[PDB]
Amino acid sequence: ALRFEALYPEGMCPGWSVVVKGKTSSNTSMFEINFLSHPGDQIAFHFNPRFASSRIVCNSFLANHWGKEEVNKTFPFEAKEPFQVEIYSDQDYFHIFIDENKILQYKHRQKQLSSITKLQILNDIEISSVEITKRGLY
Amino acid sequence: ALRFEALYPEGMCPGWSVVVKGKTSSNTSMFEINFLSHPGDQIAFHFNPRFASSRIVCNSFLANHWGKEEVNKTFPFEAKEPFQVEIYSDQDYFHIFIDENKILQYKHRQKQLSSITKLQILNDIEISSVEITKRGLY
Ligand SMILES: CC(=O)N[C@@H]1[C@@H](O[C@@H]2O[C@H](CO)[C@H](O)[C@H](O[C@H]3O[C@H](CO)[C@H](O)[C@H](O)[C@H]3O)[C@H]2O[C@@H]2O[C@@H](C)[C@@H](O)[C@@H](O)[C@@H]2O)[C@H](O)[C@@H](CO)O[C@H]1O
Ligand SMILES: CC(=O)N[C@@H]1[C@@H](O[C@@H]2O[C@H](CO)[C@H](O)[C@H](O[C@H]3O[C@H](CO)[C@H](O)[C@H](O)[C@H]3O)[C@H]2O[C@@H]2O[C@@H](C)[C@@H](O)[C@@H](O)[C@@H]2O)[C@H](O)[C@@H](CO)O[C@H]1O
């Protein structure tokens, strides 16, 4: 189920942060935050915390296929407890912070960063806030 | 021109805050922030700062007609200068704060508040941030 979508047609990458606060409803489901590129609604970045297995799966869906999964060594979420996830893009990575701690980086596979105009948040997350902010590049 | 859209299908009213930060590009154009209700994409609240005339026009577009304009001349904007607009809904009004000053309140005309699932930001605004927060008091 779609919980939140945002569209910024001029392209929200690189140099933008998405900050999502919320918590899961279940102990053993999952949610995803996807960054989609236009045209095609390809998934440039899929961030998928899976609470049954305590694994964060990251991937891209390009040319009608999922690529190689990048699975983080740790799982800094707790089911049913509030978290903050920030995803910030630079020229080379999506950088993921959870509760203000740097957790992982994911190298861009879709290189056409300015085509990433759409954010979707799906499945088991009760959102308390979404912030989309133009940070720039440092 | 659509600059930003957000969809929150469970309803973002009442008790949510939307904070928009940005600046205009022109000295004498205009932008609008619209809260839309589903089904129908009716405009529950249209917030339209008009820089040529220094007037904030507020209205609703329901049953295929604009209603009575509620116009504020406080116009605490300056062309090309960063601003912060916060729109917070309670059970009775949309409350508007600009640069942390309360400017106006607008009584709900669309009474089906939970049907307000969509935010659109159009025309002459260069967005630097959009934040959408439940329990908009915090
Ligand atoms: C079984 C399969 O086809 N793939 C397994 C991997 O699961 C997919 O992992 C992807 C990330 O690498 C996505 O998370 C994907 O789900 C998303 O995409 C699909 C379309 O592909 C749907 O839109 C989902 O709604 C969306 O979340 C995962 O596939 C889904 O879950 C699988 C377990 C399976 O039930 C699929 O049918 C379902 O679409 C899995 O991570 C990997 C390791 O276990 O094994 C692959 O086989
Ligand atoms: C001329 C007219 O039809 N209406 C005048 C008022 O202008 C409209 O004001 C509305 C709020 O009360 C909206 O701001 C509207 O613009 C929005 O909606 C229209 C569709 O109705 C379009 O989608 C626009 O893109 C959108 O911003 C205003 O109408 C627009 O501006 C007018 C000046 C005119 O050019 C219209 O054709 C255009 O749609 C105006 O504020 C009022 C002042 O007294 O006079 C009304 O007649």
Numbering used by the authors:
A (entry chain C), B (entry chain A): 3 to 140
What does the paper say about this structure?
Galectins are multi-purpose effectors acting via interactions with distinct counterreceptors based on protein-glycan/protein recognition. We report here the first crystallographic information on the N-terminal extension of the carbohydrate recognition domain of rat galectin-5, which is precisely described as an N-tailed proto-type-like galectin. The overall fold in ligand-free and -loaded rGal-5 is composed of two antiparallel β-sheets (F1 to F5 and S1 to S6 strands) that form the characteristic β-sandwich structure. The presented data shows that the N-terminal extension can adopt an ordered structure and shapes the hypothesis that a ligand-induced shift in the equilibrium between flexible and ordered conformers potentially acts as a molecular switch, enabling new contacts in this region.
Our attempts to crystallize rGal-5 bound to the blood-group B tetrasaccharide were unsuccessful. Thus, we decided to test chicken GRIFIN (cGRIFIN) as a model for the binding of this compound. We were able to obtain crystals of cGRIFIN in the presence of the blood-group B tetrasaccharide. These crystals diffracted up to a resolution of 1.14 Å. The GalB moiety fully superposes with the galactose moiety of lactose, forming H-bonds with His46, Asn48, Arg50, Asn59 and Glu69. On the other hand, the GlcNacB moiety is rotated in the tetrasaccharide compared to the glucose moiety of lactose. The GalA moiety establishes two additional H-bonds, one of them linking the 6′-hydroxyl group with the NE atom of Trp66. The second one extends the binding site beyond the S4 strand, linking the 2′-hydroxyl group with Glu32. The superposition of the lactose-bound rGal-5 structure with the blood-group B tetrasaccharide-bound cGRIFIN gave an RMSD of 0.69 Å for all Cα atoms, showing the similarity of both complexes.
